[PDB]
């Protein structure tokens, strides 16, 4: 079913533009290959976690804009491009300004109205 193994062209099929599949060293991919065998093997082995008492930065992003009515925790996946504050340098600015969708989806009723017209005339 959906768990059927995949190919690198099939892999390039799913994800959108602009990502790299570059790995790290040549001693961690072999860990990922033994990981299957070691998912059984190293889970049967010594392991644990602990914490120490010691005194103690915290970045994060809500919607970065004048107001930008709120984003549900999932919708980030769609609207992530709006979160970054890089601004003012073509099509990428049309997709970027097209987030007025977000104003239609979530927000106050007036934002939905005005947004709706603005996107109609565009």
């Amino acid at each position: 079913e959906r768990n059927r193994p995949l190919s690198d062209e099939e892999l390039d099929a799913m994800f959108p533009e602009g990502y790299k599949v570059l790995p790290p060293p040549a001693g961690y991919v072999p860990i990922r290959t033994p990981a299957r065998k070691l998912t059984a093997t190293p889970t049967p082995l010594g392991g644990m976690t602990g914490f120490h008492m010691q005194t103690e930065m915290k970045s994060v992003n809500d919607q970065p804009s004048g107001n930008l009515p709120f984003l549900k925790p999932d919708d980030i996946q769609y609207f992530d491009k709006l979160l970054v504050d890089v601004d003012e340098s073509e099509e990428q600015k049309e997709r970027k300004i097209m987030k007025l969708l977000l104003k239609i989806k979530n927000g106050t009723p007036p934002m939905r109205k005005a947004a709706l017209r603005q996107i109609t005339d565009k």
């Binding site: 892999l11 602009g18 990502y19 790299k20 599949v21 790995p23 961690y28 990922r32 970054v84 990428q92």
Partner: peptide, 21 residues
């Protein structure tokens, strides 16, 4: 790879190299 590699074998991973992503 280290962190995410806990739960299972990686099919693969992509990373945005582009100004927005």
């Amino acid at each position: 790879y280290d962190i995410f590699g806990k739960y299972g074998p990686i099919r693969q991973i992509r990373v945005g190299n582009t100004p927005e992503t």
